C-alpha cells in the first residue's frame, strides 16, 4: 500500500502537455517540499499522451493519462495518489 515513487512523463512542445508544464513550473517545488523523501521523476515523452506513473510496494505500478488536463486536474490527481483515495 505504501507509495514508492511517482513518475511524470510530459512532452516538451505538445499542447496536450501544457497543463502538466504549467503544474510543474508553478508548484513542483512546493510539492517537493511537501514530500522531501519521495522521488518524483520528471521525464519527457515524444508524440505520446502525457502520463503519470505510481510505483507501490513489491513492484506494483499503475498509470493514469494526464492528456489535456489543466494544472488543477493533475494536481488533484497527485493528491489522490498521495493520500491513497480513488
Amino acid at each position: 500500500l505504501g507509495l514508492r515513487e511517482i513518475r511524470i512523463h510530459l512532452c516538451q512542445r505538445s499542447p496536450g502537455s501544457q497543463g502538466v508544464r504549467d503544474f510543474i513550473e508553478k508548484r513542483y517545488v512546493e510539492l517537493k517540499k511537501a514530500n522531501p523523501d519521495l522521488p518524483i521523476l520528471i521525464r519527457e515523452c515524444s508524440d505520446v499522451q502525457p502520463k503519470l506513473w505510481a510505483r507501490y510496494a513489491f513492484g506494483q505500478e499503475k498509470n493514469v493519462s494526464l492528456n489535456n488536463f489543466s494544472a488543477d486536474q493533475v494536481t488533484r490527481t497527485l493528491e489522490n495518489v498521495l493520500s491513497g483515495k480513488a
Binding site: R4, E5, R7, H9, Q12, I24, E25, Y28, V29, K32, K33, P36, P39, I40, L41, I42, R43, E44, C45, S46, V48, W53, R55, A57, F58, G59
Partner: protein, 460 residues
C-alpha cells in the same frame, strides 16, 4: 564517442573512431583507442561458487542461479541491496531495479556520488551537461570547478581547446593548476572562491556578467567529496546570479555538470540512488555487485556472512570477495544502451559474442528472476527497451539531446539545506597523465595501458 570496432574471425582487432560532429568529431582518446587489449585478459567465463574450503570453483549456470535465488527468496526488503559499476548498460540497470523492486528493495545504488538534497535526480537538468558538447563552440566564457577535463573527458577538453583557439574563448578554473593544453585563469583552489564569486566580490563575477554566453562546468569528482551538496549549491548560486543579472539570453542553459563514468546518467534517469550511503546506513544481508569494482563497500562494511553476488566480465577487486560469480558481457559483446554526460542515449552493437559461458546481463537478471518465481514481464531485448521507455522514455531516443530546462526549480530547492564548505583544496583524482590510463577494470587488465604508465613514469 562513436567508434568502429574491427573484428576478424570472432576476435576484436582494433578500435577506430567514427565521425560524429556533435560528440567527438573525428577523434577518440588514447584509452578509448588502446584499452581493448584488456578485453582478452582476466575474463570471467564460467559461473563460480564457494566450495567447502571457501574457495571459488566452477559450477553450472543452473546451480549458481538456484543458489542466488534461494538467498533472494530468504530475505526481502531492506536486507537486499545492489551496487552498479561504471560500465553497466540501461538494460541491466532496469532489469536489476525491477528484480529488487519485486523484493520490495529500494536500496539500488551506484558507486558514483551525486548530491540528493533538493531536487536530486528528480529533475534531469540537475545532473546533465545542459550546454552540450557542441554548445561549447558558442560560449564566450567558461568556468571549470573541481575538475580536470583533459583526463576526465578528453574530447570535451578538445572541444574546449578548439573553441579557445578559434572563438577566442575565455577559460577560468577553480582547483589545482593542472595542464589543460591551453592557457586559462587560475582563480584559486579553495572552495570559498565559489562563495566569493556568488556574493559578487570577485572580479570574475563581473567578467561572467559581461559574458553573452556564460558557461559554468562542475565535475562529478568535486561532488565525490563530502562537500558535494554545498559545492553544487554554490555553483547553482553563481548560475542563478548570472541569470538574474545578465537576463534571459534564451535557451542557453548556463548550468552544467561533467560526468566521468558511462553508466551514471542512465542509472540516475532510472531512479538509482547516487552514492553508496544507503548501504552504509542500512547494511544488507544480500548484496548485488553489478560490475562494481570501485571498492566502496568491502566485507568490513557488511554484516557477518553477508551474501555477495558479483556479475561482470572481468576478474578485479569486486570478484574475490563474492560468494557467487555470474559471468557477464562486455560493451563489445552486447547491443546495449548508454547515455552520455549530455543526456544523449546511444546504443552499441554486437561485434563478438561473450566468451565461454558468459551471457547478456539483462538475460542473466531475467533468468534469475524466473528461477526465484519473480518472473519479469520482458523476454526479448525489444521488451526490455519497452520497459526502459516505460520508466524513462528518453532512453529510446537514440540521438536526441534536446531537453527541458528546470534550473529555477532545482536552484530554489537547493536553498533548503545549508551545509558548510570545508577548507580542503579541490584536487582532481587524475592529476597527471599517469593517472589517466588505469581507471576501470578493462583499463586495469590492459597491457598497453600498463606500458603507457611505465613509459610516463620513467622515460627512455
Amino acid at each position: 564517442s562513436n567508434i568502429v570496432v574491427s573484428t576478424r574471425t570472432g576476435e576484436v582487432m582494433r578500435i577506430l573512431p567514427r565521425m560524429h560532429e556533435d560528440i567527438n568529431e573525428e577523434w577518440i582518446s588514447d584509452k578509448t583507442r588502446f584499452a581493448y587489449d584488456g578485453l582478452k585478459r582476466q575474463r570471467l567465463t564460467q559461473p563460480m561458487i564457494r566450495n567447502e574450503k571457501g574457495l571459488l570453483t566452477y559450477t553450472t549456470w543452473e546451480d549458481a542461479l538456484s543458489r542466488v535465488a534461494g538467498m533472494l527468496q530468504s530475505f526481502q526488503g531492506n536486507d537486499v541491496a545492489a551496487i552498479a559499476g561504471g560500465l553497466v548498460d540501461a538494460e541491466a540497470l532496469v532489469a536489476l531495479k525491477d528484480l529488487l523492486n519485486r523484493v520490495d528493495s529500494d536500496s539500488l545504488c551506484t558507486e558514483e556520488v551525486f548530491p540528493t538534497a533538493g531536487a536530486g535526480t528528480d529533475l534531469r537538468s540537475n545532473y546533465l551537461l545542459n550546454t552540450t558538447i557542441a554548445g561549447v563552440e558558442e560560449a564566450d566564457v567558461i568556468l571549470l570547478v573541481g575538475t580536470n577535463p583533459r583526463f576526465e573527458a578528453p574530447l570535451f577538453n578538445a572541444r574546449i581547446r578548439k573553441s579557445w583557439l578559434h572563438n577566442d574563448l575565455k577559460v577560468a578554473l577553480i582547483g589545482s593548476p593542472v595542464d589543460l593544453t591551453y592557457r586559462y585563469d587560475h582563480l584559486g583552489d579553495s572552495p570559498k572562491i565559489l562563495q566569493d564569486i556568488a556574493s559578487g566580490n570577485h572580479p570574475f563575477s563581473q567578467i561572467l556578467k559581461e559574458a553573452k554566453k556564460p558557461m559554468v562546468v562542475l565535475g562529478s569528482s568535486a561532488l565525490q567529496r563530502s562537500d558535494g551538496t554545498a559545492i553544487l549549491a554554490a555553483v547553482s548560486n553563481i548560475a542563478q546570479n548570472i541569470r538574474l543579472s545578465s537576463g534571459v539570453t534564451g535557451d542557453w542553459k548556463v548550468m552544467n555538470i561533467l560526468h566521468r563514468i558511462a553508466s551514471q546518467v542512465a542509472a540516475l534517469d532510472l531512479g538509482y540512488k547516487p552514492g553508496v550511503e544507503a548501504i552504509r546506513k542500512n547494511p544488507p544481508k544480500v548484496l548485488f555487485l553489478l560490475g562494481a569494482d570501485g571498492g566502496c563497500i568491502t566485507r568490513q562494511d557488511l554484516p557477518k556472512d553477508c551474501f555477495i553476488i558479483y556479475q561482470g566480465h572481468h576478474g578485479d577487486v569486486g570478484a574475490p570477495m563474492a560468494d557467487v560469480i555470474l559471468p557477464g558481457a562486455a560493451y563489445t559483446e552486447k547491443s546495449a544502451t548508454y547515455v552520455n554526460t549530455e543526456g544523449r542515449a546511444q546504443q552499441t552493437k554486437v561485434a563478438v559474442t561473450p566468451p565461454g559461458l558468459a551471457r547478456e546481463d539483462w538475460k542473466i537478471i531475467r533468468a534469475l528472476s524466473e528461477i526465484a518465481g519473480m518472473t519479469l514481464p520482458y523476454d526479448t531485448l525489444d521488451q526490455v527497451r519497452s520497459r526502459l521507455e516505460e520508466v524513462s522514455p528518453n532512453l529510446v531516443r537514440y540521438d536526441d539531446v534536446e531537453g527541458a530546462n528546470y534550473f529555477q526549480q532545482a536552484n530554489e530547492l537547493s536553498k533548503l539545506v545549508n551545509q558548510q564548505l570545508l577548507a580542503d583544496p579541490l584536487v582532481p583524482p587524475q592529476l597527471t597523465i599517469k593517472d589517466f590510463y588505469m581507471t576501470d577494470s578493462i583499463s586495469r587488465a590492459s597491457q598497453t595501458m600498463a606500458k603507457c604508465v611505465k613509459a610516463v613514469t620513467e622515460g627512455i
